[PDB]
Design a binder for this molecule. Sequence first.
Ligand code: HEM
Length: 153
Amino acid sequence: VLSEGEWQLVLHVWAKVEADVAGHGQDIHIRLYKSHPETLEKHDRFKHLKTEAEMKASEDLKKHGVTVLTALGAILKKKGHHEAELKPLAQSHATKHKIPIKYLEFISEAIIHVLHSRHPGDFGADAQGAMNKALELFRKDIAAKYKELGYQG
Ligand code: HEM
């Protein structure tokens, strides 16, 4: 659905994410929890992290962010051909964690915010539009997998 040029813009900025996955992941989660506080309630082990410095120093949160972004990067590198990578994520997020698609919108907003904050010269309007399209495709396809598992979130 994305053009090849759009995928190239997505993967160009993703290579910059991969220079510091941990740091990008922490900034994305800090942004997510600040912008949309309801999302932190899904994480029991992160609730005692009350300040930004605590969140940055938390190995548990840091490792979680790398897990999250690694999964997302592997999906993005498939350029839409991602059923195999996407199914297990849908399974856990639909049936165990119970993450509504709206929360996937919230973290998508945080990803775009952090990428622009860190890489404005590599993340202008066309690259933002390409990343938005890629994350829209991800959210569309994961919502279809949610429903196949019986989850309407
Ligand atoms: C880009 C979107 C996301 C990706 C790629 C992603 C990926 C992952 C991965 C790979 C795991 C570990 C294996 C698993 O349990 O599935 C995970 C765990 C988890 N995710 Fe997500 N996730 C995303 C968004 C979210 C959002 C928005 C929330 C909640 C607001 C969330 C909540 C959780 C929870 C609660 C766990 C279990 C963490 C633990 O106990 O250590 N995820 N996620």
